[PDB]
Amino acid sequence: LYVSAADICGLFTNSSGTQQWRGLARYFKIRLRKRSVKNPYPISFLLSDLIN
Amino acid sequence: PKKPKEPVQVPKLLIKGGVEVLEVKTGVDAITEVECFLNPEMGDPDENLRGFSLKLSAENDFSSDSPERKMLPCYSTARIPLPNLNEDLTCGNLLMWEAVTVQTEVIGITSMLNLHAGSQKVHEHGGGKPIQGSNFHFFAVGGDPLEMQGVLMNYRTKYPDGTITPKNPTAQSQVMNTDHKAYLDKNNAYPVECWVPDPSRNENTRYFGTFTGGENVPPVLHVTNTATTVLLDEQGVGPLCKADSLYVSAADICGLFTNSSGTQQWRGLARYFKIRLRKRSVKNPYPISFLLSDLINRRTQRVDGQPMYGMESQVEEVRVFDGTERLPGDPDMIRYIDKQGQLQTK
Numbered sequence: 001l002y003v004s005a006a007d008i009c010g011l012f013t014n015s016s017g018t019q020q021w022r023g024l025a026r027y028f029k030i031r032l033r034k035r036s037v038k039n040p041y042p043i044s045f046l047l048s049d050l051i052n
Numbered sequence: 053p054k055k056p057k058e059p060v061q062v063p064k065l066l067i068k069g070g071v072e073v074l075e076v077k078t079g080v081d082a083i084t085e086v087e088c089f090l091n092p093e094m095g096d097p098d099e100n101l102r103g104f105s106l107k108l109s110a111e112n113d114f115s116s117d118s119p120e121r122k123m124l125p126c127y128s129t130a131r132i133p134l135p136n137l138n139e140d141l142t143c144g145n146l147l148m149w150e151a152v153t154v155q156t157e158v159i160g161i162t163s164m165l166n167l168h169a170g171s172q173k174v175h176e177h178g179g180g181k182p183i184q185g186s187n188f189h190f191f192a193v194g195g196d197p198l199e200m201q202g203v204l205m206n207y208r209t210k211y212p213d214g215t216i217t218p219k220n221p222t223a224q225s226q227v228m229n230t231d232h233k234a235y236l237d238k239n240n241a242y243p244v245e246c247w248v249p250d251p252s253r254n255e256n257t258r259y260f261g262t263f264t265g266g267e268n269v270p271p272v273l274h275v276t277n278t279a280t281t282v283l284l285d286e287q288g289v290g291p292l293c294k295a296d297s298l299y300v301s302a303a304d305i306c307g308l309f310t311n312s313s314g315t316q317q318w319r320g321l322a323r324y325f326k327i328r329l330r331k332r333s334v335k336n337p338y339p340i341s342f343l344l345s346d347l348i349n350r351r352t353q354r355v356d357g358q359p360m361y362g363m364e365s366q367v368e369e370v371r372v373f374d375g376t377e378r379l380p381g382d383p384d385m386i387r388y389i390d391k392q393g394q395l396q397t398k
């Protein structure tokens with residue numbers, strides 16, 4: 001399960017004025033289940049990768 | 053009014069286009085026709101002079117012969133990636149592509165009528181000397197790479213680094229030598245003067261070629277879109293594409309181009325190909341224990357144990373017991389199977 005994020009939350013300005021970024025962490029709550037799918041790759045695809 | 057007669061059922065074109073068209077999910081009885089070409093690899097001595105070779109070294113010594121890479125014509129080769137026939141066959145059947153029919157042609161044959169192009173003056177006030185000399189026209193179509201044979205002359209020739217050559221030639225290499233087997237696995241490397249296709253090992257390709265060697269012979273070239281070469285064997289099968297790949301090879305030396313100073317160099321032309329494909333039901337010749345043996349041998353750790361196989365093996369006796377028999381009087385007996393039947397020494 002591939003989870004990716006990018007949270008830039010503005011510019012922190014220092015005492016001398018020198019700005020710099022600031023980010024915060026991001027929570028994830030993924031609800032999964034078991035999906036019945038069809039086998040895409042039989043042993044004909046699988047034998048032919050040995051010859052590959 | 054009067055309706056015309058019903059037109060004859062021809063095969064239905066689904067999509068014409070480039071190489072991206074092969075990906076279409078079609079039925080079982082689909083047929084494709086791949087049209088392609090190969091450029092000759094004649095040496096190309098600079099960027100302005102594609103299709104020619106470098107000028108020929110005239111009289112090298114037989115012992116100290118050392119040619120250069122730009123004057124050796126090489127074989128052309130190419131692999132055409134085919135998509136997989138992803139099906140759901142039973143009892144170990146598959147589908148593979150089959151090269152049914154090739155239809156080849158040399159592209160550019162009337163370019164040799166250019167006589168005002170730095171060719172040698174044919175007589176005192178004549179035109180230009182046309183391209184003529186030793187010519188070789190080859191093409192090979194198969195589902196495997198072109199397996200060839202290293203047979204040359206003058207084994208003491210010092211070839212350059214770019215050309216791949218027969219390894220360690222002897223005097224036996226000037227005739228048939230079984231040690232010089234190789235594939236055609238690289239474009240513009242294998243020179244024509246060292247490598248002939250192997251008559252003993254091209255079980256899956258169909259290679260066709262002719263050679264005519266003379267000081268001045270006519271290059272006779274025919275150009276036609278109705279000629280048709282059938283690639284089927286005695287059993288009615290063509291080149292099967294084991295890996296989903298179609299291998300196309302060629303070599304077209306047309307002759308020697310004599311310059312105005314009298315200095316000769318080669319000339320090559322391209323070669324059109326038109327392979328007609330179909331889908332063949334074959335069987336799986338291999339058991340399931342080749343799939344699983346390759347899965348295990350890349351997930352189990354490699355153990356550097358003591359030798360348990362070979363000439364320094366440490367397995368001393370293996371005995372196989374199957375079924376019951378009456379008690380034999382010799383416990384130190386020796387039993388095996390020789391060629392077909394169970395034999396029993398002492």
Ligand SMILES: [Ca+2]
Pocket residue numbers: 251252253254255
């Ligand atoms: Ca053979």
